[PDB]
Amino acid sequence: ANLLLQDPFGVLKEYPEKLTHTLEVPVAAVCVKFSPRGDYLAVGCSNGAIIIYDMDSLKPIAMLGTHSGAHTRSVQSVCWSNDGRYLWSSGRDWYAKLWDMTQPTKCFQQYKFDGPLWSCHVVRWNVCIVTVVEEPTAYVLTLTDRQNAFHCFPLLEQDQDISGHGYTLVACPHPTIESIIITGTSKGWINAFQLDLEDKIRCCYEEKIANANIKQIIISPSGTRIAINGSDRTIRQYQLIVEHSVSIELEHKYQDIINRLQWNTIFFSNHSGEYLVASAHGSSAHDLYLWETSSGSLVRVLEGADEELLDIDWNFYSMRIASNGFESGWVYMWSIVIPPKWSALAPDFEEVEENIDYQEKENEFDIEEIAIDLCTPEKYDVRGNDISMPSFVIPIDYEGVIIQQHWA
Amino acid sequence: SVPVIPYLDYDIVDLGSDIKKPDFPQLSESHRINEQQYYITEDTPLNKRNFMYQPCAANLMLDKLKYCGTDYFDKSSINLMDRSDKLAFSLDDHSVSVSENCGWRSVRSDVCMKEGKIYWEVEVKNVSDTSHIRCGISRREASTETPVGCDFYGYSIRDKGLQVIHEGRLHTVLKPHEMQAGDRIGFLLTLPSLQSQSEQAMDYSLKRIQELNNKFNKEFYKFLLRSCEPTNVVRDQIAIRYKNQLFYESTDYVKTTKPEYYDNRDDMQKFYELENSSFEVFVNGVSHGIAFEGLTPFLPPFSELQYNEKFYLHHEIRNKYVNNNRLGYYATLSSFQGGTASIITEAMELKFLPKDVDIKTLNDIYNEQIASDIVWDLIDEI
Numbered sequence: 050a051n052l053l054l055q056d057p058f059g060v061l062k063e064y065p066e067k068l069t070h071t072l073e074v075p076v077a078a079v080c081v082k083f084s085p086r087g088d089y090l091a092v093g094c095s096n097g098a099i100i101i102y103d104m105d106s107l108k109p110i111a112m113l114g115t116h117s118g119a120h121t122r123s124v125q126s127v128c129w130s131n132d133g134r135y136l137w138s139s140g141r142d143w144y145a146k147l148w149d150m151t152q153p154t155k156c157f158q159q160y161k162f163d164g165p166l167w168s169c170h171v172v173r174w175n176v177c178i179v180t181v182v183e184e185p186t187a188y189v190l191t192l193t194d195r196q197n198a199f200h201c202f203p204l205l206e207q208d209q210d211i212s213g214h215g216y217t218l219v220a221c222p223h224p225t226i227e228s229i230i231i232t233g234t235s236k237g238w239i240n241a242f243q244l245d246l247e248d249k250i251r252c253c254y255e256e257k258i259a260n261a262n263i264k265q266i267i268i269s270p271s272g273t274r275i276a277i278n279g280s281d282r283t284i285r286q287y288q289l290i291v292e293h294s295v296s297i298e299l300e301h302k303y304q305d306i307i308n309r310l311q312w313n314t315i316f317f318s319n320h321s322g323e324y325l326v327a328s329a330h331g332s333s334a335h336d337l338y339l340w341e342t343s344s345g346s347l348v349r350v351l352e353g354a355d356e357e358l359l360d361i362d363w364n365f366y367s368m369r370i371a372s373n374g375f376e377s378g379w380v381y382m383w384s385i386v387i388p389p390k391w392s393a394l395a396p397d398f399e400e401v402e403e404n405i406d407y408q409e410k411e412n413e414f415d416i417e418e419i420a421i422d423l424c425t426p427e428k429y430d431v432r433g434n435d436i437s438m439p440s441f442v443i444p445i446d447y448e449g450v451i452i453q454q455h456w457a
Numbered sequence: 458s459v460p461v462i463p464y465l466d467y468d469i470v471d472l473g474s475d476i477k478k479p480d481f482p483q484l485s486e487s488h489r490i491n492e493q494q495y496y497i498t499e500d501t502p503l504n505k506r507n508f509m510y511q512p513c514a515a516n517l518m519l520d521k522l523k524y525c526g527t528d529y530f531d532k533s534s535i536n537l538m539d540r541s542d543k544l545a546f547s548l549d550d551h552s553v554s555v556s557e558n559c560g561w562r563s564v565r566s567d568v569c570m571k572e573g574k575i576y577w578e579v580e581v582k583n584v585s586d587t588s589h590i591r592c593g594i595s596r597r598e599a600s601t602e603t604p605v606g607c608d609f610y611g612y613s614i615r616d617k618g619l620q621v622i623h624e625g626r627l628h629t630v631l632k633p634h635e636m637q638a639g640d641r642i643g644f645l646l647t648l649p650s651l652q653s654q655s656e657q658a659m660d661y662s663l664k665r666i667q668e669l670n671n672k673f674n675k676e677f678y679k680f681l682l683r684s685c686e687p688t689n690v691v692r693d694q695i696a697i698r699y700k701n702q703l704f705y706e707s708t709d710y711v712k713t714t715k716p717e718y719y720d721n722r723d724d725m726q727k728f729y730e731l732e733n734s735s736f737e738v739f740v741n742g743v744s745h746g747i748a749f750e751g752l753t754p755f756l757p758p759f760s761e762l763q764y765n766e767k768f769y770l771h772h773e774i775r776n777k778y779v780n781n782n783r784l785g786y787y788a789t790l791s792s793f794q795g796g797t798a799s800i801i802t803e804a805m806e807l808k809f810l811p812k813d814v815d816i817k818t819l820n821d822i823y824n825e826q827i828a829s830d831i832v833w834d835l836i837d838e839i
Binding site for chain 2: 408409411413414415416
């Protein structure tokens, strides 16, 4: 990532504001999920496809589900491994297909569940937490050393009933602790179960925030702020403190005051969650919102699309916002759009915007052995990212490219 | 083709009034340097569009002419016409001083150097490492916006080491020495006689009419150059009312290329250089040598006055290569970023005065300019 090192400066602004791309995907799509690096964009589809695009030319590199383990029903969620090599994908076919891009169209392993699925969230590339329909516990799917037995440990202490606290529907693993996973019931309580990765699970937090059907829980990537999306028209960002012993408090609430509408999806910025981005629900909701998570106010509104938007992904490496269409199925994409500069034409050019008063010097009327290294890749970019941990590039299907010229 | 402009109420003076007939140079508060407020002129014209200006006075006795040309100040000093719009001078020391945010300008004092020997000193007040000045000599041709030395219409020396300036180049030909806040530079400019000047000017007039002329018509530029006299004046100086006052516009000289002429003797394109010229500088009295010896000869055939080349050729008619009594080198001064230099005029304010009988003070030829101005125009009054 060396464009931005000399792009030049003036690209750090922490959101994109112009929509630049539009994946004209005919088969409508629910969930979108970028690669961990800015390379690819997985597109969870309605008719059972999971299209995988290469983000550089807006056209796919494969559509997995040909050889083994096609999601027959609609797919609700897709996450990736920590590197970007595997892919867990939970659909409504009661399966949770873990893919391997090395053998692209062939699923690695799956598992039959108790019903359709809401989501999946990958903690280590094997273990994955999957939300079974209307079950008061989440069955963590740990892909063991043997590929046939995934111990679906109940994510619940043995006797703490949550009847009246609700039913587990979401679970987002904590980034900077990785052993606590916060899970959301359906009547406002939020259970916090710490995996030992034995199976003991301490209930580090059980508390009702409001008597609402929790739709979605997200964590900042520094684990500092946690926001909840109730079934009341409110977003509740908290302040998360854990060493274990965990504790939250109400920082701010977010609501549609005028239109008084529901929130579909919510997402946090890269570093510490200085920005929240939410998608409203009703008619005439044509635009994602932004929020200064400290001041609490609606900073900006990303007026791109034409009709409601469902899923939000924010890959900060590309600084992009993928946002699927609720109606058309098309996948709008915002992007920090740099303009060119003619100061790149010559090594002594300069682009000023004021008629500058050059002051006269005198002579307008008068007529290398330094430290050179080629071995270390750069450790950071202008966003402070974890570059130089080499991402899993896609293996282009070189078993089937040779026919791929002829008839797909 | 135009009538003579009539007089006004202030123009007819009377015995008693002590007002000065060229209306006073209105001054403007420039800045504070050398513990002095200096001043730019605010409401008196400047020389632009290749003109030179002079405040006329309505002279009631004269009939054909109704006016006379006049200078402002009593003794010799800077004429405020060929200077820059940020070039400030005070009524205390007469040091020119640009502000610290203003650049290399030039200021010419009104005394012409045509023939003989003229000597004067120039006081230097504030020349820092940041503020500079370039003192020396220039014709009427050298633009007062650029500093003297980029061209063959002026010559000067630097401030530190006094690197002698021509064609923009810096020449270490003299003894190198630096200015400080208290020096004073004297100028022994030895000039040829106007008789010697007239013959070398007439020689080029003969050497240019046909000698390289074997453009679509070469007779009329030869006819203009027949019609090229050494000392004869063709002046078109007319009174004008500008800013509620009365002034002259005089035709000024343009820039042109180098005077070269093929002498069949040495087989090289020879340069026109004046006879016996010398450019000697004083540095607190000590002499430093001859900076330049080959000054340009200028009088008809090297100075092109402003000319209507599409109006006059079609036809009674003026000439390009004429005199107007303003023709020659002047007391020339420059200033940079607050660099201050003051011009000294009279023998009583001179400290290092050499003993030649040919030396006349700067005020002296100014009086001879006072002598020449009226009586040349009295001759043009018939």
